[PDB]
């Protein structure tokens, strides 16, 4: 098992090594559109871009660029849209992508300001009396309600196509206690958060892809998605044993780059997946336990 | 203290983060000579080259290239020559550099074959009846004696300038139990190894620079040198408190790139430096304890 492997790497202390084999093994595809001199101000980080084959295109006539990737997962039967923390100039685009892609949930795995540095624009409203209007993309965003917990918050926002006065409910899952280049507090907190997202009905096939982001849309984002896709497969084959995470990860790094930024985030992914199966494999209590462990109060 | 800081990063789990700040902060200088199409076969790794300003030049008339860097340390008052694991075609050069630079010790922090892959040429003889002759550089290398331990080995080799029949004794310190992208077994084993090198008289100012290498001459090599230079300073100012390792490291990454390859190697460097001072600050027992702990039998 992966539990065997985890037990083994842990003993050898081969996390960094195993992770460089993964880094050396990841795909590399063009990101030509991302580097166009014109799309320069549309990218938060110089070194993190979407592969052209998998980039999401804005149905905008003008420019169709947005640093975002469609991670489509064949076997798992699940797709996620990973993207960077929108910039002051790209929140209109971010919301446009959510509208066009028909997403129902948004998973923000980062905080707007982290260790003195800005990582993401305040792309949604904090108070219901102040909706936002993204003039460029012709959409209105309003806060309908929040549900603040210890380390995370779920918000029900309403997005409207000013152009058609059509309206939609977007669930927002904001994980506030996961540091940049860091790991979640424990498998409990993470697993408790995933499952909240899962129950929201947000990761559901009847909707467009869940949009997952962090500052660059690769570290915490790859980690979030890695753990969830692996649990998916284990179920799809409710014979967990046959799940190779490193391989799941390599399949995922074909759609977007750098999914999983640190060896420890890789080690974490194992802990989280291993713990998870306890539930998938059958254990009921575990879920209820994660909630306690997650100290969501 | 760094012990305070270590205690702090450990609690926050900010090793990867702190290390990227270091990675983002490191210098970048040309490596133009390293990339000359002609010097291609003189480099083990495509991505690890010496900065031109600090590269070591072979007093060879032909080509003067060798992927090696002179880490000169002002305050510490110590210089090390970090280089890659010589290639089949560059052991003549490696020995030439040792001769011209007048080094007395060689610290090999890697094994020739690691996890099924070759990392370094058998650049020295394993048996006394079989000396080596590097025809290109006109030098003869012979094994005079070895001292095999659990995890390391010291060899006394004799190198001769066939050209002048002049001869020299080169102490070779081979650390065999430090994995690629890995850490030494414990602060005990490391500290016990450094100190052996230290006593050999090899790190002594009356000789040319100690040549330290691993496969690329940056990970285990940066770690080895980081820990030693920090202990140097702490002594030079026997007011340990004022030693910033991250800064020592940044000063070191000005002479050669990537010195310290992983967050854990960074965390290790702290443990090792912290432990070390116990001895520098005065504790005698500690040394003798490291020997025991190092299980050098």
């Amino acid at each position: 098992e992966m539990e065997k492997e985890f037990e083994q790497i842990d003993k050898s202390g081969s996390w960094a090594a195993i992770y460089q084999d993964i880094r050396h093994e990841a795909s590399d595809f063009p990101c030509r559109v991302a580097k166009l001199p014109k799309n320069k101000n549309r990218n938060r980080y110089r070194d993190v871009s979407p592969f052209d084959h998998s980039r999401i295109k804005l149905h905008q006539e003008d420019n169709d660029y947005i640093n975002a990737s469609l991670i489509k997962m064949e076997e798992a039967q699940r797709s996620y849209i990973l993207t960077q923390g929108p910039l002051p100039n790209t929140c209109g685009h971010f919301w446009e992508m959510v509208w066009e892609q028909k997403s129902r949930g948004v998973v923000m795995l980062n905080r707007v300001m982290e260790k003195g540095s800005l990582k993401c624009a305040q792309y949604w409203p904090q108070k219901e009396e102040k909706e936002m209007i993204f003039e460029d993309t012709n959409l209105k965003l309003t806060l309908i309600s929040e549900d603040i917990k210890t380390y995370y918050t779920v918000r029900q926002l309403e997005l409207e196509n000013l152009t058609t006065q059509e309206t939609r409910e977007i669930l927002h899952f904001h994980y506030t206690t996961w540091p940049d280049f860091g790991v979640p507090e424990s498998p409990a907190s993470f697993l408790n958060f995933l499952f909240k997202v899962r129950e929201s009905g947000s990761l559901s096939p009847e909707h467009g892809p869940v949009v997952v982001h962090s500052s660059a849309g690769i570290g915490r984002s790859g980690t979030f998605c890695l753990a969830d896709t692996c649990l998916l497969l284990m179920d799809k084959r409710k014979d967990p044993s046959s799940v190779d995470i490193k391989k799941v990860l390599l399949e995922m790094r074909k759609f977007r780059m750098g999914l999983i930024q640190t060896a420890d985030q890789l080690r974490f992914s194992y802990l989280a997946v291993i713990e998870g199966a306890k539930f998938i494999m059958g254990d009921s209590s575990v879920q209820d336990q994660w909630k306690e462990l997650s100290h969501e109060d | 203290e760094m012990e305070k800081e270590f205690e702090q990063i450990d609690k926050s789990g900010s090793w990867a983060a702190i290390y990227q700040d270091i990675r983002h902060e490191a210098s970048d200088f040309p490596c133009r000579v390293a990339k000359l199409p002609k010097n291609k076969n003189r480099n083990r790794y495509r991505d690890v080259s010496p900065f031109d300003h600090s590269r070591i030049k072979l007093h060879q008339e032909d080509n003067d290239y060798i992927n090696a860097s002179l880490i000169k340390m002002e305050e510490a008052q110590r210089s090390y020559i970090l280089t890659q694991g010589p290639l089949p075609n560059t052991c003549g050069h490696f020995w030439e550099m040792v001769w011209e630079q007048k080094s007395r010790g060689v610290v090999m922090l890697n094994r020739v074959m690691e996890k099924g892959s070759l990392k370094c040429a058998q650049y020295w003889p394993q048996k006394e009846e079989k000396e080596m002759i590097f025809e290109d550089t006109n030098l003869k290398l012979t094994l005079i004696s070895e001292d095999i331990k659990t995890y390391y080995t010291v060899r006394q080799l004799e190198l001769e300038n066939l050209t002048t029949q002049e001869t020299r004794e080169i102490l070779h310190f081979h650390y065999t139990t430090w994995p690629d992208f890995g850490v030494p077994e414990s602060p005990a084993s490391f500290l016990n190894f450094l100190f052996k090198v230290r006593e050999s008289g090899s790190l002594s100012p009356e000789h040319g620079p100690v040549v330290v290498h691993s496969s690329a001459g940056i990970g285990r090599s940066g770690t080895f040198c980081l820990a030693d230079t920090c202990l140097l300073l702490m002594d030079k100012r026997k007011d340990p408190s004022s030693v910033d390792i991250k800064k020592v490291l940044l000063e070191m990454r000005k002479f050669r790139m990537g010195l310290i390859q992983t967050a854990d190697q960074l965390r290790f460097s702290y443990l090792a430096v912290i432990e070390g001072a116990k001895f520098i600050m005065g504790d005698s027992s500690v040394q003798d304890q490291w020997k025991e702990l190092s299980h050098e039998d």
């Binding site: 110089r46 070194d47 993190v48 | 983002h24």
Partner: peptide
């Protein structure tokens, strides 16, 4: 400098 994440 600023620009990078990796």
């Amino acid at each position: 400098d600023a620009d990078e994440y990796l």
